[PDB]
Design a protein around this nucleic acid. Structure first.
Ligand SMILES: Nc1ncnc2c1ncn2[C@@H]1O[C@H](COP(=O)(O)OP(=O)(O)OP(=O)(O)O)[C@@H](O)[C@H]1O
Ligand SMILES: Nc1ncnc2c1ncn2[C@@H]1O[C@H](COP(=O)(O)OP(=O)(O)OP(=O)(O)O)[C@@H](O)[C@H]1O
Ligand SMILES: [Mg+2]
Ligand SMILES: [Mg+2]
Lengths: 455, 93, 98, 87, 107, 95, 88, 107, 93, 455
DNA sequence: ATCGGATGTATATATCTGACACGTGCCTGGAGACTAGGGAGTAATCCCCTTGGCGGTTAAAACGCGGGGGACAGCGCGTACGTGCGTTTAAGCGGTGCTAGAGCTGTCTACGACCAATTGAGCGGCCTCGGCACCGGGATTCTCGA
DNA sequence: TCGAGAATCCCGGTGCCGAGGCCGCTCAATTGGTCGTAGACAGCTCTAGCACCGCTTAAACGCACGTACGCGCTGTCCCCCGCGTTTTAACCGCCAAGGGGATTACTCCCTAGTCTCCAGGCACGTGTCAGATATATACATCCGAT
């Protein structure tokens, strides 16, 4: 069939050969009338192949049509700018903003069919579902596919109601927790083909009798390209675990929690995690009032006490830092710390407004990049955004799900890095953090050691 | 496991009273609560009547007396009418 | 000049529209936090069912609405229209709960 | 110092002035003296204290650790305010 | 022989056998006469019928065809017999009766 | 002559200090019998039964007058009036 | 004619105005509106009707013909007004 | 062997055996534990002691050596906790608590 | 026929509390009826608790819980202390 | 011993021989230290023997002393006047009147011991008991002894508390209902001697084995003189029973009562008695309002309808009438009837004040006796008073106890009558009145046919 | 503001007196011993439902300001009610007669419990469709300045 | 006064979801005998409620007077309502972990049922003392002339 030998003429820029192979894969799927998962690793231009394939469907098979692209909120500007850079000839816009503006946009453009590509976030989709359900979509494109890993999630349900000629999924981390997630994704891709949960489960029941069958069943539905066997031009990542103890305040509060010491303690896990991260997250442990930010912050927190030394050092080495955390409040603590330390942060979080997010990213990726450290959270700003300017990623606290950390560390070690990436994960000795690290390791091995080793 | 309630019986009564209306789930929970409440009131009063009179048996006449004591005004007369009607018909067959 | 209602009209409109409806009137999250804080003083570290908290809110609003009806009648009896703490106190005194 | 934003200074204050006004309006009240809100909060707190005490007693007796709808219903019925629609 | 339900024999729609069991396991008395269940079943059936017709009328006046707690509350609180019977009962989602004191109405 | 009110306080003190019944036995008994005739003709009574009725009735009326006085004072008065009685009964929930 | 001297024109009027004043004085009342006595008589009569109805119900359930102190006591306890000092 | 009353073993004055019989003959539950009568008798004895002590004090304040319903009423209505316990209870020949509203008293 | 009351026991308690005071007969009847009233309250509450928890036995735990529910304030704690003391001593002997 | 042959010198007037015998009997009892019952028949001067015996105890044994004479209220003036007529030398007064006057009299005379004879009614005795109990009485004299026939009667109890040297009883009708009354009286007379109820009962258990023993036991304790064997000079009474039916109103109301026809009917006996006497005693049966007294009264009452004929007739014969009744209201009806009939009544009843009673009796016994008919009641004015002026006694309605009728009919047929006495008892045919008449006859035969036949 | 004199009230005293505390005989109900059985405590399992925090959205709450109308004080004016006096009438206690009615006793006997077998009715599970909730759009109505 | 004008009501249209209808268990209700005891019945007896009257006496009833209290009117002011702006905290959905509730199986120990004594509680006399009454006396107090 149409094998699409060389780089597209209509697509600007030159794409590397494996990108052409992926585009060919997509075209094959489109003609065969099957939909698959572009599960390529983090960092490679998955957006670029997607745009190329849309350019195919517009300029070869001549179907501009309605195109729906769903993505995390932070990456909507990224998609818009990229589609305006590679094929600046398609009608594309972001369906975001106030509900008044959203309804206005619907009435003008969405109901006027004056569009080709629509970019929307999950919340808008689940919100603006009635008008979108009135369009016979050709392709529905979901970035960050592991978001629908639960089939009862109302995003999953709503997506299972749109009129779609065909579907297509992107995710850098396809397998998250167990097998059932894959069935969840595929039931969205090919509902008729699978339509079976227990049959899928018992066809394998979690040697060679299964894992080989595992590969065989999904060989045509998935495509992965590891960065080691495909790019290689990239210096590899350097990870590190900085084992630390606890300070006096930390130790005291840790026991106080342990022997149950009028405040509500129901999930002991999160209380211990707060303790290990920073005891000031507990109310009142900070001396005062008056509340002053001079220096009592750093020394009574083993995490931050080590952090100050390491950050200052790297400042003399003159590199750039990314800080990921699980908690917005700890992020506030860190921000106050830099305010004391006279650094130039560029904090992003789940409460940050859209254009503020755009402005922050553009600030940190500026030429000469006035900013030093950039404050993040693993969920909100830990997907898709392209902070290649920095070179040192610091995971303040580990996550219960390793792939959420893989995405975070790969937000800097992606194409066009041209540096050495050093990832400094902080752990606390003799604490639950060790346990969460262990469980994350088992969940991650259940993944890498089995499914995607050949890929 | 299995929870028993008066749902189907209240539904039958409704389909005899208004053969064309419906009742939502919260409302039928409310009817279930009402039925259990009034049942327990009548039964408790009948029990203590039998205790006062040193009987050891709950009979239709204690049920009748407890009904007259609980239900007010016009309710009591019609309720007793309906109950005597039912027991008469029952003992005929 | 801008349009303004008399100081007593919007009150009547609110009365009509709130006696017409059936939903809850206190915000669910603040009520839940209050319940948990109170309940902590009898036994520490209790769990609640969502239906338990909802039952408590139903009963609480019912009680307060009845109390405000009694307060209003007392205030009218005193030949006012503004209800006051003395009216609440009298109403609860007559009901034998203070 | 962004870590020191604020606290809602109590949970009883979460029963806001507008919410009390809505309860009063449902009751049928037209004007509300400005001091009504404070003893309204007091009254509500007392009522909740009684009912929750009773329900926690029931839960302790059953050797459970979760208060349930049925425990609350029993507490109300015991205090003399039967509640229909929860079991 | 062929079983006939006591509810059938008395021509009832409430379960005589179930009511009899509830009486007997409720610790109300040492013994239970045979007509007590029939009488009690008939009485509960009657009371339910009354509240139901009232609530159905209340719904119909709202151009609606499913009963809801609002309708139940209106039905109960609008007549004196049932209001007196359920004088100390809270009905969830019931609302209140529309009522404004006359002195508050504008002159 | 005493000024109006002094004897009222004096008799308040006397009657709150005492304990006996305040309605006459025969009037109350006749009233009870007449009321009872409307539920079942030809009833007999026990003297203790009529005394029980009188105890309960007097207690009830004393409580009602206490609440009535509270209402009248609330309305900024000292004279109790039928509207005060009606308000007390309505709030108590006897209407 | 000495036959037609007089009747008390009711029994409810046997609850004399002085007696009602005395009950009010025990209740703590100082000054009494002249209209009070009729409402007091009405209130009392209603109260008695409720209690006596219940007591007679108890009596004739027991198949007796004499209203007893215990019938009255149960009637009051039913009403929600327990009475101490008459048996039970 | 010589007999010992359950009341004596528990060192009470209220009778455990009678309370046990009343529990079992009152249709409260199918079976009655062994310590229920003891525990209940202890509680009733305590409450009676409390009321009696208060009423005896009230009598002694009147230079009286016999409790009468008036003294019982005074004790109960002046102890706020017992008053809460017996809120809905009428004591024959009890009288009322001396109470005059402040507004009435002369200036 | 024989009628049983709490007279002799109430008298014993009185002679332990006030060793030199008497009680007239009307007050004695009042105390007898008070004792019966509170007994019936506690027993009924224990019965309902045992029914709720699907048990078929009234034990010191149910009586204790019913006392907590009925008696308010300091009376609850004092009464429970008295009762547990008595049951402890009873079991020890 | 002192046999007291002839008429007392100190006593005025001449007393007939059997009176001397009775006085001798009393003196014998006094010396023997036993007390007995002067049970002489109605009409003979029992008062006269009593006064004579007191004159004995004052002028022979020289003991003025305290003397207490208890009597029905109506006869107190009679006793006072008689003691002032026969022996006008003794300190005697009536302890009667308002409680203020009574206390005044006590303080002046009773506590001053300035008295010899005290006359009091039953109610005063039971009322004024504390001051009277402080006198060591010599003789306590009870007229109309059958008044204490019940030993639980508080009069009986109180009399059993006075300090009495000796007792003495008078009654014209000693045996009323059964045997126990005699034991009741004798236990007052000789408490130590008898002191036994069941022993008295079973010593006889109610032929000859008993009635002879009955006579023997009481021979010294009793003295009776029938008028036939002693007076031999009085005209004998003429009794008559005027059987009547019922009028329309009477018949109607009689059924209405029979089949239970919102008014209270508990003792059917008294309701029927009211019906038979006069239906107007029922409220509302009288036509009206307006209420007029012209003639509808007489014809619709068979009793009164017969009465009018008989009374009018006897008016032309020109005799005088006594009317006894059981009910004060029926007495009012009769009074209104005479008001219509323009007769001159002199009504007496239980509500009539003392001096009004005296004035009424003196009016009816006046010379030329302006009054025609005299209205009575069997209980109040049916004892002791001396209406010898009249000659026709009419018993409107029979009594449950015959002796109450014997006293009533004997209030006119007593000494110094000098006429023929005609007693007209009215009965209603086919009514309960027949039954009460029958029971009274059995009670009366149980008396006359057994006990006092020899006396 | 302060005495003077009534006037009600509290107190001490002697006297019944009647209600209470005590002593006796009986029976009936509680304690002891023993057996048998079933309720509940215990341990294991698992799964489900609670808890905590974050992410995004957005509607309600908090603050502030202008102004009018509702509460409160003050004053005058009937007017209704408290206080005091003389009469009699109705209540209270007792005495009588009486008889219906309520409570005890002994006998069956009809009815309700107990048990075993079987079946059908009711519960939980699984489907669709119609009743209702937005929702825009015009009509009507009522309010506030004229 | 009548002309804006904001709120409210219908009202047709759309979708949406919660109601209604159908399909397998399983367990609990019905049938059929068999017992045994709760109560219904008849008879007896004695007691206590009913009705009236007699007699006493204290409270209720009618009347007059004057005062202080409730009620209406006026004025002031201030406090609460109505309205606009901003932001923040509620709401709902995600996402993990894991505590805790609910079932099942085992068995044991605690309660019931029975029979046998016996002693404690009840009914019934009986002496007696705490208290209510009456009397006199002292005292606090209130309302009217200086
Ligand atoms: N042909 C190309 N030439 C230069 N740069 C490229 C090319 N293709 C991709 N990139 C780089 O890819 C980056 C954009 O992110 P990218 O599209 O790789 O995200 P992704 O891994 O495709 O998808 P996700 O959003 O899931 O990370 C840009 O920084 C751009 O430099
Ligand atoms: N010695 C006498 N001389 C004249 N008349 C006498 C004499 N004795 C008695 N009487 C008459 O007795 C009448 C007084 O009544 P009396 O004393 O006979 O009543 P009683 O029968 O004695 O007692 P009761 O009062 O029970 O009838 C007077 O009319 C008087 O004439
Ligand atoms: Mg990308
Ligand atoms: Mg004479």
């Amino acid at each position: 069939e149409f094998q699409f030998r060389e780089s597209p003429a209509y697509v600007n820029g030159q794409l590397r050969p494996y990108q052409i192979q992926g585009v060919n894969w997509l075209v094959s799927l489109h003609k065969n009338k099957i939909a698959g998962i572009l599960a390529d690793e983090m960092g490679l231009g998955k957006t670029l192949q997607t745009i190329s394939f849309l350019g195919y469907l517009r300029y070869i098979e001549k179907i501009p049509g309605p195109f729906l692209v769903i993505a995390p909120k932070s990456t909507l500007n990224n998609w818009l700018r990229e589609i305006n850079r590679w094929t600046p000839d398609v009608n594309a816009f972001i369906l975001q903003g106030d509900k008044e503006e959203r309804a206005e946009l619907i009435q003008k453009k969405l109901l006027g069919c004056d569009f080709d590509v629509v970019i929307a976030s999950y919340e808008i989709i689940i919100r603006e579902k009635s008008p979108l359900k009135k369009i016979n979509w050709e392709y529905i494109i979901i970035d960050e596919a592991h978001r629908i890993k639960n089939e009862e999630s109302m995003l999953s349900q709503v997506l299972r109601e749109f009129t779609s000629r065909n579907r297509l999924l992107i995710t850098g981390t396809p397998l998250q927790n167990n097998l059932h997630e894959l069935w969840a994704l595929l039931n969205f891709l090919l509902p008729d083909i699978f339509s079976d949960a227990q049959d899928f489960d018992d066809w394998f029941s979690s040697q060679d009798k299964i894992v080989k069958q595992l590969h065989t069943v999904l060989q045509p539905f998935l495509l992965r390209r590891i960065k080691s066997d495909v790019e290689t031009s990239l210096l590899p990542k350097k990870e590190l675990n900085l084992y630390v103890g606890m300070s006096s305040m930390q130790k005291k509060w840790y026991k106080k929690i342990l022997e149950k010491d009028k405040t509500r303690l129901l999930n002991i896990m999160m209380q211990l995690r707060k303790c290990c991260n920073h005891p000031y997250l507990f109310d009142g442990a900070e001396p005062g009032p008056p509340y002053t930010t001079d220096e009592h912050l750093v020394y009574n927190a083993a995490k931050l006490q080590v952090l100050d030394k390491l950050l200052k050092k790297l400042k003399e080495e003159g590199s750039r830092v990314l800080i990921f955390s699980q908690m917005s409040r700890l992020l506030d603590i860190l921000e106050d710390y830099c305010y004391f330390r006279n650094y130039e942060y560029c904090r992003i979080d789940g409460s940050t407004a859209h254009e503020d997010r755009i402005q922050a990213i553009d600030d940190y990726n500026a030429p000469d990049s006035k900013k030093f450290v950039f404050l993040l959270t693993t969920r909100a700003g830990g997907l898709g955004i392209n902070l290649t300017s920095a070179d040192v990623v610091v995971l303040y606290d580990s996550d219960w799900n390793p792939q959420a950390d893989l995405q975070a560390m790969d937000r800097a070690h992606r194409i066009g890095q041209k540096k050495q990436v050093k990832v400094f994960r902080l752990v606390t000795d003799n604490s639950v953090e060790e346990k969460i690290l262990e469980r994350a390791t088992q969940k991650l091995r259940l993944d890498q050691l089995v499914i995607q080793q050949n890929r | 496991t299995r929870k028993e309630s008066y749902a189907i019986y209240v539904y039958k009564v409704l389909k005899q009273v208004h053969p064309d209306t419906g009742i939502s789930s919260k409302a039928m929970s409310i009817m279930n609560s009402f039925v259990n409440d009034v049942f327990e009131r009548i039964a408790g009063e009948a029990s203590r009547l039998a205790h006062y009179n040193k009987r050891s048996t709950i009979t239709s006449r204690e049920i009748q007396t407890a009904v007259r004591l609980l239900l007010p005004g016009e309710l009591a007369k019609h309720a007793v009418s309906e109950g005597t009607k039912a027991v008469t018909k029952y003992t005929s067959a | 000049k801008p349009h303004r209602y008399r100081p007593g009209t919007v009150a009547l409109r609110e009365i009509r529209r709130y006696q017409k409806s059936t939903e809850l009137l206190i915000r669910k999250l603040p009520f839940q936090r209050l319940v948990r804080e109170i309940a902590q003083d009898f036994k520490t570290d209790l769990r609640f069912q969502s239906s338990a908290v909802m039952a408590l809110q139903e009963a609480s609003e019912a009680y307060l609405v009845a109390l405000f009806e009694d307060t209003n009648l007392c205030a009218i009896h005193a030949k006012r229209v503004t209800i006051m703490p003395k009216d609440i106190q009298l109403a609860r005194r007559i009901r034998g709960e203070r | 110092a962004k870590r020191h934003r604020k606290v809602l200074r109590d949970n009883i204050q979460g029963i806001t002035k507008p919410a009390i006004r809505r309860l009063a309006r449902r009751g049928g009240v037209k004007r509300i003296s400005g001091l009504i809100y404070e003893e309204t909060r007091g009254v509500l707190k007392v009522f909740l204290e009684n009912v929750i005490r009773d329900a926690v007693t029931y839960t302790e007796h059953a050797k459970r650790k979760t208060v349930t709808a049925m425990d609350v219903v029993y507490a109300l019925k015991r205090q003399g305010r039967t509640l229909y629609g929860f079991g | 022989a062929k079983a006939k339900t006591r509810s059938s024999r008395a021509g009832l729609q409430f379960p005589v056998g179930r009511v009899h069991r509830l009486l007997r396991k409720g610790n109300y008395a040492e013994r239970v006469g045979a007509g007590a269940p029939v009488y009690l079943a008939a009485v509960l059936e009657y009371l339910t019928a009354e509240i139901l017709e009232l609530a159905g009328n209340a719904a119909r006046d709202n151009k609606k065809t499913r009963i809801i707690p609002r309708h139940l509350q209106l039905a109960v609180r609008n007549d004196e017999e049932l209001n007196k019977l359920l004088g100390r009962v809270t009905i969830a989602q019931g609302g209140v009766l529309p009522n404004i004191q006359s002195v508050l109405l504008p002159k």
